[PDB]
């Protein structure tokens, strides 16, 4: 049996394009052109295998 | 009460931001209060008097039709004047989260400037020139920029509007970014023309007074 | 499309580091609810007898 | 920073929506900045410079007292002009969530129109007439409407204000609702009167110039 | 849609509150729409047309430069007029959550008034005087106050701005607080000066018409 998570949570912060100039980090930083890509794939949030 | 107060806004979009209209305000076509709900926001669903209409009303109020004569004794054309400023830059571009010569973006008074770590203010300004082109190319708040003649670390800056623009000196990435106001902006709108001088002796005056008739050319 | 089939019983572990000597009993087993008698589990790291 | 930024607004109600006041702004009674906090919002608890006061200030600025002479060479009365438009309608009223002839409400540029499924644009317009009455009866953004003379599926529309109104063509329930702008609105406020023509020879001009003195009648 | 509508505002700060700009609006320096995004809010990160710029634009539009001649037949100086009011107070200060003579604060039209339970309106007004000093001392919405000559429970009140101020009568702590409007505020800005009278016979009129030339002194 897995007891999994019991809540936890995620939150993402992206800034667009060069304004970051930096790539996504964990669930901390994300980056993209915001108008270019709708949605999110999430590995973008912190992922743990539950 | 902050609850239903905070309830408030929803949609932002000053179309949709409400306005308590002026009580007994006919100034619109001798009809309705300034900021009264308009068919624009009705189409958008917003049924309340709003900030949008209030701006265009007084806007439509303060705009005299082309060809209107403005008359003064002074003789300054009513036409507005944009503000012109310096942006003083100093230091060397510094990012300790990246190696030297690391391309980064720097927001200069809100203008992104792509620059690599290690650039002094001058090389930083060299990049700032690139951004100011876009600020002109995008025509955002900046009418024009010019390199400071005796300083590479300053830039002569001109704003699109006739409003007054005062900004705060800050230092990012070892680059101090400060605005040095050169020319004050002057109130006015459109393009105006002095017709010429009219000397007028008032009714019981002894002294003839001169007037300057400013037609609106735009 | 999928055979998920049957059921998964539940094993959890709680180690008791023995101190103070004494300690001939342990109460509530796993804090919530009960132990399931049919399979006895206790170890001295020698795994204790049935 | 968006946190305490987003913290922001609370109560909406542009009374309560803050405004960074103009720095060194005396234009109000030679006293205070435009949008400075007013006893209205103080009574309402809001202690900050706000959007409300900023509108009335420039409003109170752009409104010349009754009887003021506006003078131009052109001769157009300063009085504003409302925009007049067509609303072009097409198709048959269609609701597939209801049987044919199903009374529904249709928002025409934000105006609800009660209509039953199966109505063509004309019968739809027949109902649109009912709503436009209310839009006039409620006096919301619509000064008047008139049936398109040669088309039942269009309606001549007049707006209360002197502002400009541009709306987006959409098709609901098999009814396309589009706005066809007829007359442009013109800037102005109140009721004005041309006094007459004054021919004026400027100081060293050879040529007498004519002026048109517009008194404010309201 | 209210979701992404409600998404909206974030930072409040009408700098950061957006504005749908006027379509095809050159009225700023013959350049950009009113409310267009400015280097102020760019520096602040806000990239959209906003409410801030829209206020200063029409503000900068409705402000005629010093020395400009306003001409009317009537002769009222363009200068604005502040509103002057009475604040009528009644009853005895009452706090049942505290013993009699309990110092409390009372918000009079948003002005805190420190008063102790048991004070009649007069003693309440005696304290109200203290607050009005601050309202003058802080220069918040109140130009001046004066004691009602024949009534201690009323106070003659003057507001900083030239706007119109209408407030709601309320009764707190056994003290009714009501505003009695004395003088209407009049539109205008700055300090203006009548040059004098010009009698003018219009082109084909028989009757000479008099004008009053109002120079801007501030």
Swiss-Prot record, chain A:
It is found in: Virion. Induction: Expressed in the late phase of the viral replicative cycle. It comes from the Viruses. Peripheral baseplate protein that is part of the tail fiber network. Connects the short tail fibers to the baseplate. During infection, the baseplate undergoes a conformational change from a dome-shaped to a star-shaped structure. At this point, gp10 rotates and acts as a lever that unfolds the short tail fibers, which then interact with host cell surface receptors. Involved in the tail assembly. Homotrimer; disulfide-linked. Heteromultimer with gp7; a gp10 molecule is disulfide-linked to gp7 and the other two remaining gp10 molecules form a disulfide bond. The gp10 trimer interacts with gp11 trimer and with the short tail fiber (STF) composed of the gp12 trimer. Part of the baseplate macromolecular complex which consists of gp5, gp5.4, gp27 (central spike complex); gp6, gp25, gp53 (inner baseplate); gp7, gp8 (intermediate baseplate); gp9, gp10, gp11, gp12 (peripheral); gp48 and gp54 (proximal region of the tail tube). Belongs to the T4likevirus baseplate wedge protein gp10 family. This is Baseplate wedge protein gp10. The chain holds residues 252 to 301 of 602 of the full protein.
Swiss-Prot record, chains B, D, E:
It is found in: Virion. Keywords: Viral baseplate protein, Viral release from host cell, Viral tail assembly, Viral tail protein, Virion. Pfam families: GP11. Coiled coil: none annotated. The keyword Acetylation does not apply. One of its GO terms (biological process) is viral tail assembly. Baseplate protein that is part of the baseplate wedge and that connects the short tail fibers to the baseplate. Involved in the tail assembly. This is Baseplate wedge protein gp11. It comes from Enterobacteria phage T4. The lineage of its organism: Viruses, Duplodnaviria, Heunggongvirae, Uroviricota, Caudoviricetes. The gene is 11.
């Amino acid at each position: 049996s897995q007891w999994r998570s019991s809540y936890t949570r995620r939150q993402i912060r992206l800034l667009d394009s060069k304004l970051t100039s930096k790539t996504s980090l964990e669930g901390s930083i994300y980056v993209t052109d915001l108008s270019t890509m709708k949605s999110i794939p999430f590995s973008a949030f912190g992922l743990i295998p539950g | 009460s902050l609850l239903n107060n905070k309830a408030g806004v929803i949609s932002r979009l000053a179309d949709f931001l409400g306005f308590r209209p002026k009580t007994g305000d006919i100034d619109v076509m001798n009809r309705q209060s300034v900021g009264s709900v308009t068919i624009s926001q009705l189409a958008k669903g917003f049924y309340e008097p709003n900030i949008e209409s209030a701006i265009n009303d007084v806007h439509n109020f303060s705009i005299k039709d082309v060809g209107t004569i403005i008359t003064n004794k002074t003789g300054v054309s009513p036409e507005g004047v944009s503000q012109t400023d310096y942006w003083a830059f100093s230091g060397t571009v510094t990012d300790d989260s990246l190696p030297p010569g690391s391309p980064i973006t720097v927001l200069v008074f809100g203008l992104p400037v792509s620059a690599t770590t290690g650039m002094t203010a001058i090389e930083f300004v060299a990049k700032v020139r690139v951004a100011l082109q876009e600020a002109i190319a995008s025509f955002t708040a900046i009418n024009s920029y010019k390199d400071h003649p005796t300083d590479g670390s300053k830039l002569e800056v001109t704003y699109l509007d006739n409003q007054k623009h005062v900004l705060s000196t800050y230092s990012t990435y070892g680059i101090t970014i400060s605005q040095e106001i050169i020319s004050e902006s002057k109130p006015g709108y459109g393009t105006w023309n002095l017709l010429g001088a009219q000397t007028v002796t008032l009714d019981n005056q002894q002294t003839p007074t001169v007037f300057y008739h400013f037609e609106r050319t735009a | 499309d999928k055979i998920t089939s049957s059921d998964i019983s539940n094993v959890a572990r709680k180690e008791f580091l023995v101190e103070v000597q004494g300690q001939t009993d342990f109460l509530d087993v796993f804090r919530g609810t009960s132990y399931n008698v049919n399979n006895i589990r206790v170890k001295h790291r020698g795994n204790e007898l049935y």
